[PDB]
Structure 1
Amino acid sequence: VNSFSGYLKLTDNVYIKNADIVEEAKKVKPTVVVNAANVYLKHGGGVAGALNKATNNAMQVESDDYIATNGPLKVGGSCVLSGHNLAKHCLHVVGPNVNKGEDIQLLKSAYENFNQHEVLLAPLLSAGIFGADPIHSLRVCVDTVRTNVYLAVFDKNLYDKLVSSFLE
């Protein structure tokens, strides 16, 4: 029902909250939840692991069937699959993993996938163990996405740093 609450409004279409994306998906039941995926859709850890565990592995089984028939995605690409019990759809988006030497310029392409959906619940792409500068990821989101994006960032110090940096 896209009933988001407790978000700071950064711009006319970008919102942010200190929260676990899985708990937000359970509360809101959004039309679209974004997964911070990798090209073979192996949802073992981080955000992807948390979303998969909350579907009791249904997301991993569906992703394996997709990969068997279609092969891996490309960095900057995306795939709409079922949202299972968390949302109507899950938009699996592959941002660059700069810790594994992938090109940071593809982060704009990764965020461009969001523009196909009027409203989305999403994590901060390529942050955490993917190694992108999270302040830069927030700026790319703000400059690229025109649809309504509700960012859930599950770390108080990072959330505070992002808000302070944006408001400078």
Structure 2
Amino acid sequence: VNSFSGYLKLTDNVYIKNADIVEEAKKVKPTVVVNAANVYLKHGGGVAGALNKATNNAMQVESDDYIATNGPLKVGGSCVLSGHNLAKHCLHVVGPNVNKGEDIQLLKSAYENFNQHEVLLAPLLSAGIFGADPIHSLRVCVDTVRTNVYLAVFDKNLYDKLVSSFL
């Protein structure tokens, strides 16, 4: 039993809700919140910009030190950093950004990072400003993640489409 509330159950291990991931994380304080990161951990917009804003820019400060030490992430890769005031940990995961010409096949590799964590709050990878079809992202999630994932979809219209189109 966990404290996530109001989710629709899609499969044994995948759950979905129309919610603002920032407000969800503040309420639940999950062990792991997933960020829709880029390889530079520049959290300028989309989910990343919203999560970073909610940390009063502390996420960005920590991220800049991480990059200065380690260099950029790989597309499809991840790193674990602090969750600040939102969660114990933040798993920064880089899905492909179609608006950069990145291989959509890397989306499965990106979701594989979730399997290193028993329970996660997450957005759909490569959705929104990363330019992929959120319906496809949900399919890859369900077919790749085996741990317990609570998906937050900001747009109510899109949420209804993902559910009503979910196979």
Question: By the TM > 0.5 criterion, same fold?
Answer: yes
Displacement after TM superposition at 1:99 (Å): 1.6
- What is the aligned residue count? 167
1:38-89 deviations in whole A, cap 9, x for unaligned? 0000001110010001110100000000000110000000000000110000
Distance 1:2 1:12 in 2: 15
Partner of 1:126: 126
Distance 1:105 1:66 in 2: 27
**DSSP-derived class of the 2:3 partner:** coil
Q: Is the 8 A contact 1:41 1:67 kept in 2?
A: yes
Q: Is the 8 A contact 1:18 1:159 kept in 2?
A: yes
Displacement after TM superposition at 1:2 (Å): 4.7
Q: Is the 8 A contact 1:16 1:150 kept in 2?
A: yes
Q: Is the 8 A contact 1:111 1:144 kept in 2?
A: yes
Distance 1:101 1:25 in 2: 31
Distance 2:89 2:151 in 1: 17
Q: Is the 8 A contact 1:2 1:31 kept in 2?
A: no
Distance 1:54 1:98 in 2: 26
1:84-143 deviations in whole A, cap 9, x for unaligned? 110000000000001210000000000000000000000000011111111110000000
**DSSP-derived class of the 1:151 partner:** strand
Distance 2:82 2:128 in 1: 25
**DSSP-derived class of the 2:44 partner:** coil
Q: Is the 8 A contact 1:38 1:94 kept in 2?
A: yes
Pairing of 1:11-160 with structure 2 (within 5 A): 11-160=11-160
What are the ranges of 5 or more consecutive residues in structure 2 without an aligned counterpart? none
Distance 1:78 1:118 in 2: 16
Q: Percentage identity across aligned positions?
A: 100
Q: Is the 8 A contact 1:75 1:110 kept in 2?
A: yes
- TM-score after normalising by structure 2: 0.98
Distance 1:93 1:144 in 2: 14
Change over 3 Å in CA distance of 1:149–1:46 after alignment to 2: same
Distance 1:70 1:54 in 2: 25
